[PDB]
Design an enzyme around this catalytic site. Structure first.
Site, PDB file in Angstrom:
ATOM      1  N   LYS E 154       0.805  -1.218   0.000  1.00 34.08           N
ATOM      2  CA  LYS E 154       0.000   0.000   0.000  1.00 34.08           C
ATOM      3  C   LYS E 154       0.838   1.267   0.000  1.00 34.08           C
ATOM      4  O   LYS E 154       0.654   2.154  -0.836  1.00 34.08           O
ATOM      5  CB  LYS E 154      -0.914   0.004   1.211  1.00 34.08           C
ATOM      6  N   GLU E 180       0.534   5.218  11.743  1.00 34.49           N
ATOM      7  CA  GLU E 180       1.456   4.414  10.960  1.00 34.49           C
ATOM      8  C   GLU E 180       2.856   4.570  11.536  1.00 34.49           C
ATOM      9  O   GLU E 180       3.066   5.294  12.507  1.00 34.49           O
ATOM     10  CB  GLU E 180       1.409   4.802   9.487  1.00 34.49           C
ATOM     11  N   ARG E 181       3.827   3.886  10.938  1.00 33.14           N
ATOM     12  CA  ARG E 181       5.168   3.882  11.499  1.00 33.14           C
ATOM     13  C   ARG E 181       5.766   5.274  11.435  1.00 33.14           C
ATOM     14  O   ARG E 181       5.677   5.957  10.416  1.00 33.14           O
ATOM     15  CB  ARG E 181       6.070   2.903  10.762  1.00 33.14           C
TER      16      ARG E 181
HETATM   17  N1  ATP Z   1       7.329  -2.831  -6.408  1.00 34.29           N
HETATM   18  C1  ATP Z   1       6.969  -3.048  -5.128  1.00 34.29           C
HETATM   19  N2  ATP Z   1       5.790  -2.639  -4.637  1.00 34.29           N
HETATM   20  C2  ATP Z   1       5.436  -2.860  -3.364  1.00 34.29           C
HETATM   21  N3  ATP Z   1       6.205  -3.497  -2.478  1.00 34.29           N
HETATM   22  C3  ATP Z   1       7.406  -3.953  -2.855  1.00 34.29           C
HETATM   23  C4  ATP Z   1       7.866  -3.754  -4.221  1.00 34.29           C
HETATM   24  N4  ATP Z   1       9.082  -4.299  -4.323  1.00 34.29           N
HETATM   25  C5  ATP Z   1       9.374  -4.808  -3.107  1.00 34.29           C
HETATM   26  N5  ATP Z   1       8.369  -4.604  -2.240  1.00 34.29           N
HETATM   27  C6  ATP Z   1       8.339  -5.001  -0.827  1.00 34.29           C
HETATM   28  O1  ATP Z   1       7.050  -4.931  -0.235  1.00 34.29           O
HETATM   29  C7  ATP Z   1       7.255  -4.383   1.064  1.00 34.29           C
HETATM   30  C8  ATP Z   1       5.946  -4.012   1.730  1.00 34.29           C
HETATM   31  O2  ATP Z   1       5.356  -2.869   1.132  1.00 34.29           O
HETATM   32  P1  ATP Z   1       4.688  -1.769   2.073  1.00 34.29           P
HETATM   33  O3  ATP Z   1       5.688  -1.271   3.065  1.00 34.29           O
HETATM   34  O4  ATP Z   1       3.938  -0.813   1.206  1.00 34.29           O
HETATM   35  O5  ATP Z   1       3.607  -2.603   2.875  1.00 34.29           O
HETATM   36  P2  ATP Z   1       2.284  -1.790   3.187  1.00 34.29           P
HETATM   37  O6  ATP Z   1       1.377  -2.002   2.021  1.00 34.29           O
HETATM   38  O7  ATP Z   1       2.744  -0.414   3.558  1.00 34.29           O
HETATM   39  O8  ATP Z   1       1.655  -2.551   4.437  1.00 34.29           O
HETATM   40  P3  ATP Z   1       1.769  -2.035   5.939  1.00 34.29           P
HETATM   41  O9  ATP Z   1       2.046  -0.565   5.917  1.00 34.29           O
HETATM   42  O10 ATP Z   1       0.411  -2.363   6.471  1.00 34.29           O
HETATM   43  O11 ATP Z   1       2.900  -2.847   6.493  1.00 34.29           O
HETATM   44  C9  ATP Z   1       8.161  -3.240   0.756  1.00 34.29           C
HETATM   45  O12 ATP Z   1       8.787  -2.842   1.964  1.00 34.29           O
HETATM   46  C10 ATP Z   1       9.164  -3.986  -0.070  1.00 34.29           C
HETATM   47  O13 ATP Z   1      10.058  -4.645   0.811  1.00 34.29           O
HETATM   48 MG    MG Z   2       2.022   0.926   4.940  1.00 34.77          MG
END
Ligand code: ATP
Ligand code: MG
Ligand code: ADP
Ligand code: MG
Lengths: 85, 460, 55, 85, 458, 85
Positions: E154, E180-181
């Site tokens: 996300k 969030e973080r």
């Molecule tokens: N192209 C990409 N798009 C999304 N994520 C990716 C991609 N390539 C690698 N990732 C990995 O996916 C991980 C998780 O994505 P993200 O931090 O957006 O999680 P999130 O959707 O923010 O969920 P939450 O905030 O609830 O943990 C990224 O930190 C990365 O390590």
């Molecule tokens: Mg997130």
């Protein structure tokens, strides 16, 4: 202080509502001026009894081939549209 | 004189306080003027000092705290007798057909105890019906209880209109129809149908529709029994049709928590089994007279495991389980031959050829069911020849269970068929013995006797 | 050439059926986990609602 | 008449019911959620010409009025077993 | 004037005299040790007692303390003063810079705009992301939602949209971090201030380390600034970090406020609380708020009452999923749940509409074939079915793209793809022009051309 | 710092929350189990030199502190999709 007006909730009703966007209390929100109601009516009423009904033999046309061929609707029916988002 | 005052009105439940002498007893009636409207209350609990908690037999709207209540010292009492024939009434036994007063000779209380164990009378006088599948798989005796189980839209009402046509017209005795929680349109359509067919002079109708407050839907089933029990005590043979046993229990569920009861397993009331028992143990054929009854049973969500259908299964002599699958496949009536049964399906009491035919039919269809997913994944070519045979005969049997009804003619555009019991046996035995193995499946679909299967086969 | 192709056919069928047996076991072990998680949630949705109703 | 989301009405009535501290039922809906929707929907009907003539005090004769309803429901993941559906 | 009578965790009950009891959303002030604590009134109980939520740490409060009754809501600075700065839920400055030089302060509890005031625009907006503006394209002024569980991407997608849609947008933007973080906030702040675009992005941060009062009202002080900029006539971009946490703070508080539990354990006012928040975030006739929101689903459960009551509030829903991510296909956008109000041929064109439906029809058929393949393998399929399995696998690979914001985790250079390129690519695959290329050629490439080159070097 | 199991701290907090009659949520965990873990884990951080100078009142200067924290979780039959994971 709260007074008790001994009257149930009534709503503007009539022909002049055709074309009007209205809130639950009968206040126009389209902004096109006040309503032209044919008196008020009560919101909570009871339905016609068994003797007062008549059977359904007149169609209401959806215009959709699937509905109007397989699942026909008539004037007085109570069809439920159900499904996901 | 009036003697009590309203002290709470929470939704449909009304509390009344009385002097601590002469507090109304349970199941009594009470009366209050809801403006111009005379409103009846039924007493459900004696709780605390002088207070009774009650259910409104009408709309609760318009009631104030401090209104005077008058206690009638009897239960709800309804007209019973010949004066009830041809008349629609509500739960209170007031006419809703606008034909005037009922004109009753006698009135009876709707709460009464069931027959004693030594009063019950044994019978195996098998009724014949036009319906093939029912008369093959679940024949039922005069004086027995029949239940039609199904979820929404599987054919409960169409079946009950067919059974009313086939059984009641030959029956010379009076009949009662109890429309518990029925749709108002369906009640009007039934009333007009009977009025046109000229059988309305031997049916008494009690209607409590969906729109009515819970007390009406709760108690209307007992007014139906009270009329049928009057006819039974006169010694008549009576036909009692109940449109849904389920919406009696549901009318109990809605009001149960407001009565202070702790909730049970699926949110049902704690008293579900007793509430079902006390009603269903009155519907019996005694030594004086017989009640024969057909009940439709709604199956919430189409699961036969839900407490409400699960308990009522243990009260019935025959149980015709309809299924949504068979209806969705378009086979009508949608009776499941594997789940439905009767306690009159005994070789002793039916003909032993009937019993042998029934055991054959069930064995074959069960053997098809287990093959179904095997064919679906691994394919028909990986059956053996004797299974390819029994899968064909299974399909022919599963078509010959279908039938056109006179009351299901409006839906399909075809005439209605009545099959005699003997012809049904003769056909299914012939199919299983393979005398018609060479005919296509459609030669059996939507046909009457097997002579009509060979006539349509010739046309095919 | 025909008799040898029929022997080849029987060997290919036995290998295919062995694969279909292992894949069926693989589905059984995963559907069971879906079912067990569902029965546990059903058991906790009720009870939560009976204690809340008991109030 | 088209009721857009009898589901969100059921949700609004649940909120009102619980804030008023009425005892919850299955999924926390109050028991008179069936009574809510049934009293609402049985109002849609067709009525015989005698009822019309009686209501309009003789003005309209020879006509049957009608009200047709199309309620809409959303199910989650196609689950029909839920209370309001 | 009043005194604290109960301290139950985050909620605080205050007893006032009978004639000056505070209104239903007023703010109170306490000295909690050496610190001043603001309380917000939620309920007027009887006898002059009010239940309040503490906007800060509730430890150290003692019964019998004396509160001070301020006679206004929480009022936050708005406008040009709050433009390069990080602020608190109380609208205090959180960067170490001085005071915010505001000319005006607005209360955060306002009303949604009226029905005659709204405006509906179909003016389509273009993102560099292939799957988002193919499958569920969104227009200017409409709400976008990014659903999905934990770890499905996300935030990385939203940082991509912030990077790309800021290319064609000139105006101011508001970012609201709602539970969030903190690290992600600090990284965003330094990334914005190292690109010198911090003079337009306005930041509000009430993060996941804060007490439940701070995580409940921070989304509303985000909107109150976006609404100030909308009423100045500007087109504003509003980004919300997580809008599940606004409903979770209400779930954590609402037991102690005395409300009976609803389904699962959500507050009974879930649909109103979300409706009061997400109806004041709209484009009126005198401004426009383009907004992107990230919606955490709990436990991967799309039937849960918190996501299921948010699907009705959004114009373009983009449902990320965990399985697609496990295959490595970032962005992990499920194309069989993502949809939009703007996917109509009257607004988007027939060639685009036909391409998007063609993709859905193929990938659905592939889902139906997967259960047959799982038991039997591919060999028992019809030859047409093998053709669709090959094209559907190539389409799934081609939905992936290498973001510029993901260059750290992977190493591949980023790519921006235009709409005309992506519809040409999917139209070409659907009619089988590219049937001769291997699947791994389509993985993590931009335009179709690039895939051919990759195929040359295998 | 190595929290050896945060899925037996979550259980030992669910026990306290259920003995205090607080309404449970999903898997009967209390509504604030997220706060329980978020407050604890967000204390693991790297802090800039200005913060260290302000906290130590200038006795430590130009150095940045950090607290790495690797929590352990146990999951049943290896699914990540459970609530606490
Ligand atoms: N192209 C990409 N798009 C999304 N994520 C990716 C991609 N390539 C690698 N990732 C990995 O996916 C991980 C998780 O994505 P993200 O931090 O957006 O999680 P999130 O959707 O923010 O969920 P939450 O905030 O609830 O943990 C990224 O930190 C990365 O390590
Ligand atoms: Mg997130
Ligand atoms: N034997 C039949 N022939 C034709 N149509 C039928 C038959 N049985 C049921 N149906 C169709 O299914 C509908 C639902 O069944 P019905 O008995 O009307 O309601 P329910 O089954 O819920 O009581 C019928 O109205 C009709 O449309
Ligand atoms: Mg029916």
């Amino acid at each position: 202080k709260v007074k008790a007006t001994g009257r149930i909730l009534e709503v503007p009703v009539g022909r002049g509502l055709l074309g009007r966007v209205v809130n639950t209390l009968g206040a126009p929100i389209d902004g096109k001026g006040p309503l032209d109601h044919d008196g008020f009516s009560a919101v909570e009423a009871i339905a016609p009894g068994v003797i007062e009904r008549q059977s359904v033999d007149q169609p209401v046309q959806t215009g959709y081939k699937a509905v109007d061929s397989m699942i026909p609707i008539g004037r007085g029916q109570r069809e439920l549209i159900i499904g996901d988002r | 004189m009036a003697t009590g005052k309203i002290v709470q009105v929470i939704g449909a439940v009304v509390d009344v306080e009385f002097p601590q002498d002469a507090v109304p007893r349970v199941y009594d009636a009470l009366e209050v003027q809801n403006g111009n409207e005379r409103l009846v209350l039924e007493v459900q609990q004696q709780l605390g000092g002088g207070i009774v908690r009650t259910i409104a037999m009408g709309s609760s709207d318009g009631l104030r705290r401090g209104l005077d209540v008058k206690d009638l010292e009897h239960p709800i009492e309804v007209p019973v007798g010949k004066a009830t024939l041809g008349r629609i009434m509500n739960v209170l036994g007031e006419p809703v057909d606008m034909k005037g007063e009922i004109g009753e000779e006698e009135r009876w209380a709707i709460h009464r105890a069931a027959p004693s164990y030594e009063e019950l009378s044994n019978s195996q006088e098998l009724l014949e019906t036009g319906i093939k599948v029912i008369d093959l798989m679940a024949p039922f005796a005069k004086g027995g209880k029949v239940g039609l189980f199904g979820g929404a839209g599987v054919g409960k009402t169409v079946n009950m209109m067919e059974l009313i046509r086939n059984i009641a017209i030959e029956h010379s005795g009076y009949s009662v129809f109890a429309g518990v929680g029925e749709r108002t349109r369906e009640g009007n359509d039934f009333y007009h149908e009977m009025t046109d067919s000229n059988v309305i002079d031997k049916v008494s109708l009690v209607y409590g529709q969906m729109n009515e407050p819970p007390g009406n839907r709760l108690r209307v089933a007992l007014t139906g029994l009270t009329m049928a029990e009057k006819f039974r005590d006169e010694g008549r043979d009576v036909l009692l049709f109940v449109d849904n046993i389920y919406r009696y229990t549901l009318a109990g569920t809605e009001v149960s928590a407001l009565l202070g009861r702790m909730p049970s397993a699926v949110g049902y009331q704690p008293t579900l089994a007793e509430e079902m028992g006390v009603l269903q143990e009155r519907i019996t054929s005694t030594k004086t007279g017989s009640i024969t009854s057909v009940q439709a049973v709604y199956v919430p969500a189409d699961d036969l495991t839900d407490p409400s259908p699960a308990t009522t299964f243990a009260h019935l002599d025959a149980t015709v389980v309809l299924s949504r699958q068979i209806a969705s496949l378009g086979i009508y009536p949608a009776v499941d031959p594997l789940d439905s049964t009767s306690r009159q399906l005994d070789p002793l009491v039916v003909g032993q050829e009937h019993y042998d035919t029934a055991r054959g039919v069930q064995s074959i269809l069960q053997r098809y069911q287990e093959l179904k997913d095997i064919i679906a994944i691994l394919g028909m070519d990986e059956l053996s020849e004797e299974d390819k045979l029994v899968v064909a005969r299974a399909r022919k049997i599963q078509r010959f269970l279908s039938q056109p009804f006179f009351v299901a003619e409006v839906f399909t555009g075809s005439p209605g068929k009545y099959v005699s019991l003997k012809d049904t046996i003769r056909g299914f035995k012939g199919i299983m013995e393979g005398e018609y193995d060479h005919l296509p499946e459609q030669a059996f679909y939507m046909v009457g006797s097997i002579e009509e299967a060979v006539e349509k086969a010739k046309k095919l | 050439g025909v008799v040898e192709n029929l022997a080849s056919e029987q060997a290919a069928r036995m290998v295919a059926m062995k694969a279909a047996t292992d894949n069926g076991g693989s589905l059984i072990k995963e559907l069971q986990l879906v079912y067990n998680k569902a029965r546990q949630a059903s058991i906790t949705q009720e009870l939560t609602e009976i204690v809340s109703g008991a109030a | 008449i088209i009721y857009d989301d009898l589901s969100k009405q059921a949700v609004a009535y649940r909120q009102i019911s619980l804030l008023l501290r009425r005892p919850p039922g299955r999924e926390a809906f109050p028991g008179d959620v069936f009574y809510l929707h049934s009293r609402l929907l049985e109002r849609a009907a067709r009525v015989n010409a005698e009822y019309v003539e009686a209501f309009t005090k003789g003005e309209v004769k020879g006509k049957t009025g009608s009200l047709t309803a199309l309620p809409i429901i959303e199910t989650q993941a196609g689950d029909v077993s839920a209370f309001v559906p």
